[model samples]
Target: TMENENKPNVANFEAAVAAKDYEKACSELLLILSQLDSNFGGIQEIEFEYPAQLQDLEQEKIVYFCTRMATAITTLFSDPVLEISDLGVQRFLVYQRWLALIFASSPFVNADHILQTYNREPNRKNSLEIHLDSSKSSLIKFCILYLPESNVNLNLDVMWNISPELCASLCFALQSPRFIGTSTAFNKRATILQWFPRHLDQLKNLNNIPSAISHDVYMHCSYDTSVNKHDVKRALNHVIRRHIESEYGWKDRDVAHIGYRNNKPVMVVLLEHFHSAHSIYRTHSTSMIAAREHFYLIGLGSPSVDQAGQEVFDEFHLVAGDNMKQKLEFIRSVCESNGAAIFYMPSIGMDMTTIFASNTRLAPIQAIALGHPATTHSDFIEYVIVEDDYVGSEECFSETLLRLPKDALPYVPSALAPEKVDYLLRENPEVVNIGIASTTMKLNPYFLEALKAIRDRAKVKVHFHFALGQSNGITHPYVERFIKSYLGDSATAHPHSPYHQYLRILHNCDMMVNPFPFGNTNGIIDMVTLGLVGVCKTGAEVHEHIDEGLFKRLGLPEWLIANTVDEYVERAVRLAENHQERLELRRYIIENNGLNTLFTGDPRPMGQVFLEKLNAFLKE
Candidate 1:
């Protein structure tokens, strides 16, 4: 009651946010928060409400203020040329106060921005010590629960910088009985990857036992709900694994241990899971493996670690290895076996402990494959496997270019049967339905501008159908709400659906639009599979190039791939107007083995070429 006595009137604050006046809203928020500063002891003590009835409007106000504050914090941190001053700290405190309240009210909301502020703090440790106060515990609770679930990097510096007592509290909190067997999309409780290794030494220990060696392709994958079912990462892994195993004559099999001998050295392929903490590291041998031992090893003895991770490991018969260290040792032993070749499918937010091994010489030849399909900044990852043409410059990658002679992505087709979608017979014959299927995160401001540009310039009535990928069964409200307001009655946000259901949705649409900065892979693949044309853009990033490569591989027209945002908008406009051209594009894809090209065996698998080049490198 005392805390709320002097809380400033929120009427104008809400009005400023409602009108999208971020500066006025931020000013109003700072005034209110500062006025109530005496009531709240610190950042940790600040509390925000998420009342049942005022959910929508209150959420908007919170999101608006938090969004502006986060931008301010990031803008300040991004300027490397400028030095951080006392003024910067003052600014950061204001930002964090808002962020802390936001964090408390909605832990998962704006997590990427929240993490950026914490990571860029000049005095990270002291800040953590003050703000991560055990009395309130919202900051620590947020880190332990939601950090692993986000798309952003888990900065372990946060864990290390906190006080010993707080770290102990974190470790104890992770071991709480409440977390046991509570496995859902929202509550995986996999923070052990960040904190467990420091307390327990067993995570880093390598298995010394010797076992027979085989040159088998052991593909480790994790089951996760965070990514879209049709995400490009899945397609890339699927294609690479299929091609590598087929060309190299190594079936995707489970190896007992890394302790084995290869006369020419055993070549092992390690694909990191999209959700690193839940990665499938199941071993061939059934030794009844569990990570429960590590809990006891630390003085905060518990019966078991997080069950979600342990359950997956158990399902796969993971060898005595429970953590990253054991997994690293397995790969390490394969490397030691007369210098075996190691192929790593690297992704962002990969198991941090396993990534440390990439810095060292783990194999005679180490290369990065297309899982996340981005550059690995590590020195030891000697090569990146991609198409020669897709790579515009060598400077984009840390690894030397191990170029595919042809199209890089060896796509594996969806198993769902294609459905027939009739042409639009609406009240207006000129109306066209443009499907935009992309993760909400990829729809950057520039990407949205392209969409708006196409809409403004189109000759025909454009009805946009946005089938967005979500985080934990929820779309970003701000992005979705803005899209609704901008498009008004012309836009429809399709409910997230399965491959079969979504295939039907895509079939109904005349054409799809790929987002940029990051472009579509499987989303475009799905479009092409149904003989639908997607307006794609060419850019320097690997994500931007996938669709262009697909078009090139299928001998599709160059006009479909735009070089600039203006070109992208114009192409979309032209395609929407020309019904005959759209039909012809579909006909070409339908008749010329376009669907077959995506699924059928490659005449020359890139894996064969990769090995041949690798062999040549070894001899040289």
Candidate 2:
């Protein structure tokens, strides 16, 4: 009976439908389904009793919740690479809103959110305050977006306002291994004008930085008048004195390094200046004072000004200056007093001590000229002539003459040749006069013009040979121009190369002229050596009267001196006309004079003399 109740029946459905077979069948099926459902209804019963459990297990809700949580996490951690296309108007607005919310929400937050919020803010809050408090601390964490271990080398083009304080601060901040590759120092004008208040004050106030750090820190100035050279020099001396007192006093220190550059003239001037300063300090100051530190001055170029020629005249002038004798005297006095050594262009004329001394100090002086023969002359000093006593005699003379090409005529003998005299007579015949012109301290325009007028009027060939070491080539433009104007196309300037050239020129000339009455001549010995006779017109200065010593040595008292120019001209003309007398003069020069003995010997003894003098000074 239960099985029969459970079974579906078409008769019940037909009765319920109250229709044909189809309806009757459906009604019977319904009745059978209801009975079957009741028999296996446990699942339906559970759903009815626990509806909340069924809802909790729904698939769509679970998927939606999981996706929402994942998106939230991604938004918090990852900064998405914002493509241009993704930032449409609506999306951008949403991003702005979100960014504003993020910045407003937290103290320590991501840099991205901060930047985004800053961009959106109409009136931004105090960024400095924000950075100092909240933003700066989080910067390290967010900076991980850039790879942590990857080496980042940034070449920053930094244009900084330079002040002592600023420089210190930057040095601290960068803490770079090598901070400044090159930097210019505080400009004098900038500081004086007070371009920036802070920098100007700092420069004015700061004192702890070392002098070397301060002076060498600046770039070289282009203009001569940019900064006062005298003032700078004084300041530098003060600094050096202070350093000496604090550190090594007089002893030589281990050389840090040696450098070579094409700055001969400048280097010479700087060294001479240094030597002069040291000398003054030593001479005037007490013995307890510390000695100035020595620095080696090196230069690159040929040894003599002649080799460099007129092109380097400006450089020479800058180094030696217009008054070379005066500068040299200053340097010599300093070196003699302080035991200083000067390394400079190796040449002959530069070797004389009397030439370098002031006119007032009329002591007998000597010098041993070194370097090439073309530029070297043995005639400048009064009492002594020392040859290069170090090397072999032949080698020294040979190397000296080698300044000129091998094919060129031997300098000394050719200057004395009869043929040269004949040539001079034929080419320039009107004036057979030989007048000696002495060197002057001042650039006497009248003297130069007078020489020009004489050459023009007499149609005579004139030769103005520099017998002193002061003619440091054609460095001075005015002097060089003067020389060129004096020696026109017909004249050949000898010692045209360097040291030996001076001697060669003097040998070849009909007469020797000295522009400076107070200076010494290296050509005096040669005049005696070659039997070439010349007159010296002297002035009141003690240096002007050097010919007296030469005359005394040669046993020719009458030729001792000519005080007046007329007397000088008259005597020279007489010598020019008297061939027999000239021969006798040449013979006397060869016999009595010590040219061969002084110039042809080894140079070591000469070097020893210099060293001894230096040693004596140092001992004191």
Candidate 3:
């Protein structure tokens, strides 16, 4: 009334209810939302004929010190003194104990008790469809029963086991709509390498190739190997081509820091770093392809990508037809036998600086594969491992000052899937939803006049959605017809959903907006690592100031960061009507952000920088 008598926590709750001082107007209307708290809500609870109940022994000692600070924030989501081992930074401790049991437990849990505490365990969706219908001579041994079950970084066993239609496209790649986690693990490895010849003639009969898969399936170079066609220039099994020229050939141009040779620690992958999902090449090529601690991982193969990069330019003077002296002796045998260290990972080229521009003993090629943009492929690498500020800003500049947070390269954070923090609290959002969650080329042109200016200066009933990435059923057709012509039945572009149905559409949203002047940098650190409260806008470029470098890198008070688009639709119409600053910014990013406060800030030695880049590539 009269705009709630000129608001400021409603004029201190009608001046402490006209001075009757109903417990300082119920502790100043729950101190403008005491962390969606004020001791567990609704007129400070009481049973039966309770009329605004007050137990009062100094208000039960401030609700027992806010329930012992909500049991030390659900015992810091049981991350028990944080330490994670890099599976793309272990799901941020399964997104910080799924936002710390949605603010320290017992809100009568939902989404079937948060997907039964995220499918209790034994993964790859319950032993990958009972070995995808066993015995066609148990093809590749019941298709590598979820291969060394590592998460990110490969030992996704040739990523989802090399074939048998990428092991029956994992329950339709977890109900399809792929994007992120490397475009749904490369659309289930190019839909199981194009349904591996009707998925390898229903397995069993590669000339009866099973001997527990005779030398664990080998036959290199870009598959459709004419359906495993044999003819390496007249079937020369010359002792398996002299054991592939002395065990996967690289006859010494003699480089020292060779990851490891005898004291076992050697690495070598290059089937283009095997099927990827690139969070800096699946977090340091899966601790060197799941030889994580044991070391010695090796895989080598290529016949696709110019027949495995010109079969290493066939001992120089190479040419599969004199096409410019066969890629100039394949970039001069990568400058005298693949120099010191180099990676480039390929795809997205300015001719990939012509594959390590004449390789003067390459070294700092740490990692940069998925959605490539290593500072416009830095003219033949110098130190582009990972430069995290959610990868997209000032076109990633600063070789030490065009801007510098020590100009990027250094990282660590991954360890979160502890049953993705079980859920169930679903009651919030009574109709101020506001979701968005970007995609379709980061929706620009100030997204529908910032969604009809936060649905004509919202009061209630402001729904929006657009969660993103679906399958056939249309989505970005002009963002589902401009969200049904300017917010009809309130707006939705939510599509081809996955990542656990976008974590149950980001756990039934109350706020989240971002796709503004481009800033979903690491998609707003996965929306405050799932505690939500997004907002975002900032821009006029430093790559549209990615939501204020994740709220000043976890120290917040960039308060839903907007600089303008009408202060990002007037701060999303003042938190879509401040349901107490969207429940204290989602209980302050689920009680103080963890998993190294949302990644790459530090604490990820992950086997001491792969043995200090394999002992500085063997003391140079």
Candidate 4:
């Protein structure tokens, strides 16, 4: 009778989920868990057994309930056979805590025992694994839903023990919406991000210690495009190449530009990791650079291009197979054959292929440029190039710090960007537009709370305009719902826009708020470029430091660069109220050569420092 009653509820719960009625589904789940809780006393114990007072039928009902919970959860979280969601993460954040408890509790603990009891169930083992997998998937999706009621780590410890891969992949994805973002100390988060790569090495049973004989400077970079918003690492590569060309004096030579530096044959080998569908090699002047550095510029995998385009690769090799292992083998062989003295990988997290490849020896010396701005945490990646100003806790990174005295990754401002214009603020503007020019991943619950605090405390009517940049080209349903719930009608969400259009939207704001813990690097760059007043709170990470460093460099007020969450809210509220001060802040950025400092500064210093440091490491 109890089984029959619960069956209807289980059907309703499943139906609610299918209907996209998350609230109803959550209520149903809560009801089911509550009934289970009454019997099992929160289900925390490993040794949980049926009560002595409970009859056989009641006990059987409890077991059936557990099975139902398992089935529903497994079904909800599992991917469609071979394919993962390209629509970013599937988030059911409302049930995050419940899922966490479900995974850790009696339902998870007794999966095997339950399967064994059902001897008729041949696929029970697979079914058990499915629940585990789905639970982990749910864990990843709700990883950042750090509510005020929860611990600061927000069940990170729970997730970490279960699957470090999901955690690592989540961290990697968060930075640029290729999918992930965050608030919190760099060391704490860095420790988790560092965990996966080290764990990966342990799992693979591979130790890649460098032992190279060649003097060539081999670099892995994308050859598909010159420089874009999505592939900023390409810009860093361009800067490195420019420095190499100037130093080597390559003037349209057909032969390989192998220059003798200190009686050693040093050639810059650019190994193209083909990314985009179209090849930019044919039209761009970079091709001419490749022509001079012929035999030096090689393609890892064969890109389908015309004979003229084939010139992009002095030597083109097909990837061994279509998987990471095959691709890694192909890349490893290419670097090995070249006998590279130095193998540098910039933006390691941008592609998983490079991240995996870092686990194996590719050169006598391997260094990563901080294009991704997080630690690779691999023993094989011996050094990481970072900006001096942005350097945080050294303990966070596994690789030796190759600190660049200036910008770690230089910015080349777009020529198409409109001339700097003054932001007009009414003497007492009815609505103070505060721009959130950041990706959805950066929006955490704490940050939203802080924004709510801003709205509550601010003297003027502050309207938040969110220019949401998402990976899958659409905002997550939860983020949209969250903004409405948190800020009511005061917040307006603008979907992802083109480069120029995005900047235009940002320009409309009186001031912009940089997201916390994981501060906006590129977004803040655009804000500074637009000469808009930006309020940011500093934390113990490079991402947190970018805006602070820029504000200081631009001669903006120290108050604008907050040190705490409360201070962030206070500063933002203060700035929004003071219309003239906001205008002055914008003026200061423009009048103080901020544009020249940002755009015209030579990144060669960074590249030169990298070369010097790597060479020093090689000699040692």
Candidate 5:
């Protein structure tokens, strides 16, 4: 009789309900639940059992609570999900309340700390003062009703002000691990549950907004640079005036005017026309996207919304203001527009550097930094995403330094594929091909002096392949005459070559007299990768000898890093004479796989840094 009552009452794990007896299932579930509630104590008493309890509840609650949560819609939380949310986190939160409340209501409370905890809060009352039995019972009311309701109003101004304890607990509950995931169903629905405070003065420290008539015109200004900031500001001023006249429809009567979207008065600027109409106007668009995505996820703004409502705070959550909402939407639109870009950067330098700076200061948190100038500007740059000598030359900035193991530079991806020796001279058909492939602009007196010194001390027939104007289409006649006049048919200069062809030239050459003070960063990367005997001397200026970082990252021989132009020349002479030494180094480089070593630093910590900082900022 006892076994039959347990099974027949709740459809127990071993028994099935009769066909067409659907109502019997829920009645059984509710009855089964009452039994669990009667038996279960609290956090300490029920350690491993809830997992078993949840297995039963998880299936039944979908049927039991969902319909009731739907019926109670008018009386529920601001976000309906808080009632019988498909998101497990909300249900899990309420479950925790069930645990705490049940234990406090039971006789277990008289002997334990629950009574002591209750006594300290005797004056405490929830929004409802209808005389509950214990603090646990009040918490139960909140977990089921008030919290779900309070959640939607951005803290329940329309319903009733939430109690401080419940509000504080809700904040922590959103972050708790158990509430985050308990069911397999949860992983799909959960996202950060943070939303901005709805009422005015709830937002801290930002008050005293100027009146619209005094400071702002309702004009949406369209504007369109700087060693680019000056140009940028000027373009912005011009376009804002243009936008005001064109769409926002205000003009010259404006003096030092600010418009409002937000509560505070800020200048209203429209960038979409400029962003879409011109490419140059959108230079920092990538960075702007990066910044907005960071803050967007953490509840600052730029909402990515869905029907689920976890990632959303209503635009009306802010006080009555145009600029606050208007400006936020404008920036959100811009970042999302640029956000989908998986970019293709051909070479790394100023084009990429421009992205490190000049992003529209739209309260977007910086996400991650990649490429070169981003490497040095670690201070104030949010997250540095890769490393090398760039990892070392830069101040640590507490900014994330993500490095790969040993390979901080570029290497050929398919190592097993046959290397195109379309031009490696066997020191026979042409004894040695000496090349200096630095750009025409990078050549200096030091380089010219080094070249002459190497020529004066040549042992075998050395062919000179100078890639001077090989990138840009400029060939200096004086330079051509000087190399031809000095070193006969052995020397040649190419005005241009494609990148692959250019790397082939570096591979074919026996030696390169490296340029300095403003050397080709990419040029040296190829030289070392090909195991070409390039002699580079570090310069006095930290900025000029950036190659020092490159060399140190590569762990190249000390002899390869010379001190002065004279040692630079002497090393050139040494490499020119020593044929066997050159052969052995090449053999070792290929055998030990040195090219792979160039790109050694890992680029993985960036996401963690981004997440932790995001979590920290949200907490603050």
Candidate 6:
């Protein structure tokens, strides 16, 4: 009953087609064909190129033509007198062919090129095989992933990018660690053709690569912190681990040795920021794979105090009292463990009391205090004091030993005097006069005035010496202006002399006028040894005025104190005019203290002491 009700009563396919209703025409034709036969067949072939007749049609017009042709074919193929199974098979085959043609005509695909440059067979007779046989060492592989995205530019990029000079310099530095790695970019592999197009073969043969690669090698990723850390750690750890494993054969693969290779030297890592901490952690983790080593991490930046009142080192080297002691002890212990002792005096700025106090917390090691006034202080420790006294006051040098308790050590004037003139005079009287030369060409007005007074009053012709180390040279426009304004034409200003020549001139003078911002007693000793008198001045700032202390130590207290400019000038004039007084002061300097002191006249003793300390430390 259902079949009879659904049966097609009319066949008007042509009318449907002429009405421009292809869908309806197809449906009606299919219905008519279905009624004619129970098994209705479909179109077997779908011709793509329309009989060559529509070749000249534009692309858009061709699409319209194809749509109309497709509809017509659907109507024509709606015949009931076809084999359905055969039609299905033919249509599938035609689809396969069409797909093949489309792929062949497309431009977006590529073919794979397969070529083997080297054969792995042992019997393969080639230059590469011969070299490989000769060099049996396992090849060390290094991959540098330089991330270009993270680069902040920071001028370092322009400086390093493609600059052969920088690359050569980097290569030289890498030679120390025997690193064979090259720069890479973020999310991109650095191909052999990019940097070493000509030397790909040679580059592939490099053995070791440096562990601490430049940070600029990575591109900066601004959006993500974890990504940056991960990328940096990955690259750094790879180099560190590779170097350690290839250089040292450890039973345990995960352990590494972080110390120096030959002597088991202690590493003093100086950190300036927190990111450096991450680098250190990565490096240490890799190095620990071979051997367990101690670390003396010296943080150079300020970090906040924690809840427990303990100082926390977030990024930089943060030093508290306890942390500082622990670091020092670590260094000493490492040195002692290795049959050598290390005396590490970090280049830190602190008062003498603090420096000496801190030394008590660690094992007895030779200490060197840098950037402090070299004057006699109550808490002066027996260490090689690294003081920038070249510009300090004479009193500070002469009286540096005065602050030491009298019962503590014997008074030695030469130890603190700038020049030790008395000792030099005794060694050689031919060195008659001593002069204080200015290293900085810029002469102060007060100092020049004092020097002029000495030249006018003293019978000996006072010489003014200058060196090029200060502000380039005296010919410098600024220096010239200073000289003209202060010294005038009456005084001699020798700006062309080298440092050694300047010293020679000072040794030759009968007396040296140290017109320094801060007085120098070391220069005084040099002059005194040459039988020359030293004129100095004192000021409110004890650190600035060393002449006061120098005069005190020399038993010339009257010559030590000068608060006013006129008083300083008057004192210089008096010393120049009074010949007997100058001779007496020179005689006293020779008899009381001369060549026997530590640093002034004789540097041999200081050098010897330094070596002795170093040796003793090694033994400890």
Candidate whose lDDT is highest: 4
Global local distance difference test of model 6: 0.33
Off by over 4 Å in 4: 1-321, 407-410, 419-423, 471-475, 606-620
* Candidate 2, 1-620: lDDT as tens digits: 34544344333433433433333333233343233234321112111122364465533232232233223322322332211221121222212212211221222221243233213234446332212113321322222211101122211212123224323222211211111101111122122122222232333322332221222211111011112211222222333334333442222312122222342111121111112122211111111010111222222222233322313122323233234334444444433332324222232222222222211111122222222112111222222221212122232121222121111111122232233221121233333433232221222333444345445544334444443332221112223334455646433322123435444555555545444333233445445544455666554322344454444444443652566655555555455555566456655654565433322222233234433444454466
Backbone clashes, each candidate = 0, 41, 23, 3, 35, 62
- Using Cα atoms with residue i matched to residue i, what is each candidate's TM-score against the true structure? 0.54, 0.29, 0.28, 0.57, 0.39, 0.32
lDDT of 6 at 360: 33
C-alpha lDDT of candidate 5 relative to the true structure: 0.37
Q: Candidate 2 lDDT (Cα, whole model)?
A: 0.30
Evaluate model 4: give its TM-score: 0.57
Full ranking by lDDT: 4, 1, 3, 5, 6, 2
lDDT of 1 by residue, 1-620 (tens): 45644445455556655665555554555555554343331222334444455456633544544444444433432332223333322332333323333332243444454444434335655443323234223343334333222444334446546533334333323322110111221132334423343443221211210000000000111111121211222232333333333433322222222222323223444433422132122110011111111111000101232443234221222223465345455545544543444444333324333343444455545666545555545555677766565665566566787776553343433335465645442333467989988764454445666777788889888988887654111123334554654677778766456767777777678888887656676676677667778688876656567678777777678998999889999999998988887877777776774555544333243445545655676576
Q: Which rank order by TM-score, best down to worst?
A: 4, 1, 5, 6, 2, 3
Error of 2 at 117 (Å): 63
Instruction: List lDDT for all candidates, in order.
Output: 0.47, 0.30, 0.39, 0.50, 0.37, 0.33
Model 3: ten consecutive residues of lowest lDDT: 216-225
Deviation in angstroms for 326 in model 6?
Answer: 20
Quote model 6's TM-score.
0.32
Q: Is candidate 1 or candidate 4 better by lDDT?
A: 4
* Candidate 4 residue pairs that clash: 173-179, 173-180, 174-180
